[model samples]
Each structure stands twice: as C-alpha cells, then as structure tokens.
Target: MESKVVVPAQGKKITLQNGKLNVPENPIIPYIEGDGIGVDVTPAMLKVVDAAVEKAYKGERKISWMEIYTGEKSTQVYGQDVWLPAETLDLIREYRVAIKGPLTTPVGGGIRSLNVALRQELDLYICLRPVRYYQGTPSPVKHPELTDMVIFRENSEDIYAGIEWKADSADAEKVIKFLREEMGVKKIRFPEHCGIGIKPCSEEGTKRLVRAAIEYAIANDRDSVTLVHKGNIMKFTEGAFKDWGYQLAREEFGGELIDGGPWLKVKNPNTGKEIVIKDVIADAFLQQILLRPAEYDVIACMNLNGDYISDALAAQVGGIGIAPGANIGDECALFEATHGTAPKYAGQDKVNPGSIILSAEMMLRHMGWTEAADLIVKGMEGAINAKTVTYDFERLMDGAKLLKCSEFGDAIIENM
Candidate 1:
C-alpha cells in the first residue's frame, strides 16, 4: 500500500511474539503531538521518557520516537480535507505500539472525534484507565490512596459508536417508523421529535473486553474483576454484557462454581491465585468506588458506563488532568492522556503534563520495560512529594512550588 506520510526507515519494529512478546532493546515508537496543549505536553513526555530509559538501561536501550501526525496536524500535512490519514494508521499497525497527547476535536465538525474514529477503525476495544493516588496530590476524598482501580472500558460500541440519526431528519423518521410499525418498539417516549441512538453490545465484544480485564486481574494477582453495567434498564444490551461476561469466564477460562453460580472463581493460570469474578449495578458501583474503593480492583463495563466511570474515578484521586488512558487490543495499543485539549491554555504551559507523562509510563510497561516504568513512577512521586508541582496541583496545595509544564518535566527528571 502507498503511504501519504513518510516512515523514518531507521528503527526496528516492535513485533509481538504470538504467545509471548519480549521487550526489545531498542523499539521504534510512533507518537502523535496532538492538538492544543499537546504541543506543550508531548515534548515534555518525550523528555521524561527518554530520561527514564537512559537512566534505567544506561545507554544500552532507547526508544526511537517517530512522529506520526493526526487531527488538525494531519489536515495540514497531508491535505486540507485529510483529517486522519491512512498512512498514520498504517504506521500504528507497522509499529504495534504508540503514545499520544491530548487532541482537539474539530468544531462545526466533519468527524466528531478523530480519537473515537481511530479506535473504531482499529477495533481498539479496551479503553484502559488506571487511577491511583500520588503521595501529596490534593483530592476531595479522605483516603485517596484507597482509590486505586483499573477500568477496562469496551471502546468500539454503544451510543459512543455514533449510531444515531438527526433529531428530525428523513432517515430518523424512517427508522422510527420501522421500529414502531414493524418491530413493535412502543417504548419511544417521543418518536416524532426524538433522535434515536442504538446501543450495540455483542457477545463477542463483551467477552473480549471482560477477558482482557480478567487476564489483567490474573496477571497482577488483583482481587477481582467486577462487571459494572446498567443492565436493569437496558436488559438486552447491558444485561447481555453481564451474562456473556460470566459465560466467557465459565466456558473459556475454566471458571468454576462458588457454591452454585453467577459469582464464580477462576484460578490465575500464571499466579495460582483465586481470581473472583463479580458484578455490580452501574449507579451503585459509582457510589461504592467512592465509599469503598478498595473493594473493587479491575472493572469491565460497556462503552457509556465506562466513559462515565473513567471521569468519576479520575476525580476521586485528583482529576482527569492526571489520568492516563490506553486503548488496546490483542496486538496493538495506543496510550493517551485521558484529559481534553484545553485551548485556553494552549501555549502557557500551565496545565499538568502528568496525564501524558504517565501515559508514556504505561506505554513503557506495556512494552515490558518495567524497570524504566518503575523509575518514572518514582520520579513522579519524588517530584510531587517534594512539592515541586504544576499549576493544577499547586492551586490546590498550600506550599507547592508551581513549575511551568516543561519545568515540571525537568523537576521529574531531576528527581530521577
């Protein structure tokens, strides 16, 4: 296939070793500079990442960062209309791993979000958000340390899949007429004026997502994998998620009856630990994550629920500005700052780069560079604890020294 963008031809590809993928001494990584504050945070992340790898490996290993454009940058570089290039996706496929900064969703738009489009195009089904507390970051919660949780959000579907018609279009009317007339769907509150959106949750989709969450639980020797859903309301869509999730456990993963059903125990094939599989209603699960956060470990849920939970969980520790996210599947993964691109602070370098930096930390670990990942963790903790912080955390902390965005990256490296 021909490419609209150029591939650097210098570094080696990060190949997945089918049953087991080993970390390469030097892997070529592609990164999106993102839009808005992305310019500020992207280089900040790269600086910190390069420092960690050099410190950990002492010049023996390195990351060859190949620049891959997306969103507005893509439009300018490739063509005025080309918001997302086929070559960018091709690079992601070729490399197998990537990390990106926060991107701007274009307004009066053609595409709702290039981020969403990328996920759907690649079938990147897991929106993985790991929320944990830093030693001194300000939080609304009393015991923020108890709020550690990894969320496995089903990425490619639900209302977020953009399966909807306009509020009063001909297509909307026709779809409504078909539903009410032929399909016997009488529950539409306002079929005349309503814009309808479909929530599609498939058994295969549900199982693959839950399987990833459970595999993570088993690998990490975590407590349990909780299935969070609004199944009581959307029975077929959400309830099917729960049912298929449990079925996946029992059938494919050798989950056994724990005193006769629903909640089963699957032994970790790697760690010999009893991995408990459980479920909780979406609304109640939100309350419990705040009340008894330690109770839940890894959570697997459908798209909409996962989206809500990701933001909610981010608040308990600090904010989404510090929350790192990863969209992954069996072979390829893209880690990004879960926060939005704040256009207001476009060049001030005022916001926290924690999200993107931590995202790179997640990428490092995914590549099996645990040593460098650990150093990043320590560097972050050291900087935060020393009160050498950014504007986001400084505004909340009493005696914190607020560093510029790039300065914070320097502070982190100094701690390292």
Candidate 2:
C-alpha cells in the first residue's frame, strides 16, 4: 500500500480571498530541499532571505516559502521509485517563481538529473550565471577584481539534450555502418572503447536564448551581449547557433550584425537609440577574459560552451562557491546556487553560503524588490570585506576569519 500524507496548501496555490496569506503583496514561492548538504545550507538560506525581506521592507513584502521535493528526501517520504512528484511541478507552474538547492544526479543509473528534468519540463531555456569577485576572498588570479560577467547559457538543448549512443552498441554499429556504406566514408576511426555524444543546437533554441540575453542587456543597460560559440570549426550546428543568434539580433532586435567589417551599429527608428550585435569564437572568447575582462558584459552561448565559460569565469573570480545562477523561461523562473552539494561538509556548518544568499538576492530583484536585493548584496560585500568568511574563502585569504555557514548567514543579516 502507498503511504499518504496531507500536503498543506502552503498558500502557494490558493487565491488571495481563500487565505490570510497576501500573495499579491507577498508572493508565495516554492522550494526544493534538494539532495545531500541541501538539508544544511537550505535552512540557513531561508533564514537570511526572511531577514533581508523584513529589513528591507519592514513587513511590507515577504515570500511565503512552500516546500517541494525531488531527491532522496522526497523518495523516502513518498515511496521508492519516485523522484519528481507531479505535485511539485504543479506547484512551480502555479507560483511561476521558485528556488532550490543542489540535487544529486545519479551517475550511471536511476534518474538522469532532477535539475535537468525540471529545466527541460518547464522549458526554462535561459541559464544565467553571474560571476564576480568579492573583496577579502582568496583567489589565484592577481586581479580577481577584473572578472565580472553574466553567462547566458542556452538551457534546453545542445549536448545537454542527452542524444547519444554507447560505443560497440547496436545503435553505434548502425551509425558506423551507415557512414561506411551509404556515405562511402573510408578510414573512419573509432576506439573500441568510446561513447558517442550528440550535440544538437537547434536554430529555435539558439534564437530564444540569444533573444533573452539581448533583451536583458538592453533592459539592464549592459554594454554588449557577446555571442560566444565555436562556429568557425563546427559550421552546421554550432556555426548555425552563431548565425541564428545574429539573425535574431538583426531581424527582431533591429541591430546590425558585426562580422569582420566595421562594428555593426543601428538606430531604433522610433527612439533613435543605437544597438550593436557581435560574435566571438569560443576559444578566443575564453582568452578575452584574461586579456580584456572589462570589454565584455553579457554573454550568450550554447550549452557546452556555456558550461565551460561559466565555470572558467567563476574560477577566475572565485570558485562556484560564490557564483549564483538562475534558470529562466518565458513564464517561470528558478534561482539556485551554481555549485554542488558539498556532501563532505554536510552537517559541518563550514561551507560558504554566499552563493545561495546571492541567488536569493537575484530572486528578490526578479520579484521587483530592488531594495531587498540591494541590501542582500550590500550585506554580502560587507561580510567579505570584513574578512568574516567560510572555509572556502578563508583558505585563499592571507589572514581571513572563517565563519560557519550559519554564522555567515547571520553576519549578512546583522550587517543588513
């Protein structure tokens, strides 16, 4: 027999008239506890969020957090063989705004990834990762301060779409046979030990992600939204990503495409404002971070390119420990830390909470609570400047004070 429990409304899915929870004034938001160390850091993140909201708005605004599940905890509660519960997805769809901790994705078997599943199911096509340096943090680079940029990764497609075949398998044999016979290919080499990974970057996917980046750049007054890809090598797929990205900018955004010639510049017919579009090869783009960091602002790229670029930028400034991210779509958004669950430090209270706190700040900004968002950032900067950090940041600083995860959250709140 299946076990059952009464799942409270949590005010996340009810009409304002139905409950005292003023959802319009204080939107109800859902959250996943995630796997691993999620149990520890998630609670601390929630406390910090509440304190920031209260300090910023003095009870005028708040977020009613509703709990959802997608990992080990959920399986234990619901039953075996269940990962993503339908009710959790429904709650996210109803609220349209959510946050979550890092979920464990089984390596070889079981569910692919709760994170990937959520993004794909909700059509969250834009993965935004902002990497910046905080003072008093340890970093290997001489000038970590120079690294600051937002990565706009196409979320729904590319190699992450999981289209592939195992080597020596029937599927691989079929593909190899087709290439040898039908295509008349000769000297095709494949290791007896290898798996095929398919990278599918569709024009539709490229256009949507680039469009989001361009719109964000224009809205936020960013200098430039660079299209980063390896189209120079893979002309059909990745190459098409670059071409489609530029086409959207030109056709939809009324911006000129900047190729080898003069920088593409155009003026809005009505407002008479200028807009520019440009492209950069993925590898060269990586070098630009070290060569001319300030020359770039917003970045748009495919999945694999984005994965590499975001991680690289994060490391340049700090590790994924301080990087915050968001998965956004046309109708829904989910904010999360760009790091994994440090299971080794689980229950130790020594991990850094800056990433998730900053993620909450982004969530506040998305909810139109600019004051709350600003306060969170100010608090984060203040904590780091004061040298009151966690082990992650402490190890790098010459003489920094290390605080526990909960302690750091409290420090931010106190500063706020």
Clashes of each: 0, 0
Q: Which stretches of candidate 1 lie over 4 Å from their true place?
A: 1-6
Candidate 2 local lDDT, residue 162: 82
- Candidate 2 residue 26 Cα shift, in angstroms, is 2.5
- Over 142-242, each residue of candidate 1 has an lDDT whose tens digit, in order, gives 99999888999999888789988988999999999999999999899878878988889898888889988988898898888899998999899999999
Query: What's the lDDT for candidate 2?
Result: 0.79
TM-score against truth, every candidate: 0.96, 0.91
Error of model 1, residue 242, in angstroms? 0.4
Judge candidate 1 at residue 235 and give its lDDT.
96
Work out how many backbone clashes candidate 2 has.
0
lDDT of 1 at 288: 95
What is the C-alpha lDDT profile of model 2 across 165-215, one tens digit per residue? 888888877877776789896756753555667678788889989878877
